[PDB]
DNA sequence: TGGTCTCCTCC
DNA sequence: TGGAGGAGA
Ligand SMILES: Nc1ccn([C@H]2C[C@H](O)[C@@H](COP(=O)(O)OP(=O)(O)OP(=O)(O)O)O2)c(=O)n1
């Protein structure tokens with residue numbers, strides 16, 4: 454198998470939170486700007502950065518005071534604060550706009566707030582039967598890059614738009630259109646549809662996005678990041694060997710952490726391509742049966758993880774960190790914040806019930822204690838029977854009350870997390 | 880480092 | 891009728 458059975462796209466919103474704030478406030482459009490939370494501490498922590506601001510070296514998690522040193526004219530929008538904490542409602546509602554448009558075209562898997570995988574196989578087939586064997590014009594692909602192209606010989610390729618076009622021209626001239634079963638053709642038609650999905654998103658919301666088109670989710674996701682912002686990339690099966698030959702392992706989705714580090718360390722390699730020299734059994738012996746098989750196929754551009762038909766979140770939660778000296782040290786402090794979180798949760802749950810005809814049946818409560826390395830010190834669950842903040846906050850307190858070893862609380866709490874899960878039809 | 884989150888696997 | 895952790899938005 455060559456892993457060419459599907460056409461898969463991944464659509465990803467450009468500097469998402471920034472665009473949401475720029476739509477609402479025209480003064481921020483086409484300028485260096487960032488989205489911050491909690492203005493009183495070092496100007497706020499940056500959570501999203503415009504491309505104009507990135508050119509100055511501004512990144513996520515920079516304090517805005519520090520970002521102003523790199524970019525003096527940097528403009529800022531603040532996350533809404535409600536019930537004593539950052540509130541992301543605006544961005545979740547903006548997300549809904551985008552997901553709904555995309556779901557008119559095909560089955561989506563909502564992977565995050567601002568990205569969805571699209572399974573385009575069927576849409577591609579139908580379109581190929583509609584076209585009537587007609588040639589594909591370059592005008593149908595005005596923002597598409599073909600990864601690996603242009604190659605060979607040929608005052609045009611000096612500028613980026615010039616390169617894109619020569620690349621696209623070479624691809625289209627070489628396309629055999631008379632055969633409806635050609636994976637390259639399928640991908641091309643898949644890219645035509647994504648141009649239309651992206652045009653629809655921009656028309657109906659004003660947000661711009663990037664997209665990757667390939668044969669699986671991982672290559673689609675890799676493809677998408679190759680030409681940002683506001684552009685889409687086709688990564689064909691044939692492009693993989695050259696692409697993978699200098700592709701750092703950590704750039705592939707799910708290899709950005711400890712597992713990716715172990716591949717590099719154990720095998721003595723740098724690049725995704727280098728993985729081809731190892732047998733499936735060799736990879737299985739190092740990283741386990743599932744990862745080993747996954748890597749064997751992946752380094753050859755083959756992956757089988759399906760686009761799951763799901764556009765609603767499986768969990769609805771909210772949390773607050775209480776770092777250093779702000780750590781919660783009294784029973785009444787703990788009960789107060791549990792109530793704030795519960796109240797926001799109640800509102801979001803109630804909305805979710807009316808919107809999507811479903812109820813959460815489990816409440817998960819998670820905490821961190823001061824001086825614990827781990828990201829969580831304790832997760833406990835209970836039944837969620839009523840969408841009632843007072844009940845949910847009191848029940849949350851019950852199940853964690855045993856952690857106190859002192860009405861003082863010790864050790865102090867650095868984190869609270871309430872999460873509603875286990876949805877069933879209502 | 881940061882902060883408010885979601886999805887997944889392992890045992 | 892679970893809880894810890896990894897990996898990413
Ligand atoms: N660690 C993170 C990552 C993301 N986000 C939020 C803010 C982002 O705008 C949105 C989407 O995340 P992306 O990783 O897609 O980043 P952007 O959309 O901001 O930039 P890009 O244009 O590179 O996708 O999720 C966040 O709060 N914290």
Ligand SMILES: [Mg+2]
Pocket residue numbers: 465466467468469567
């Ligand atoms: Mg994005």
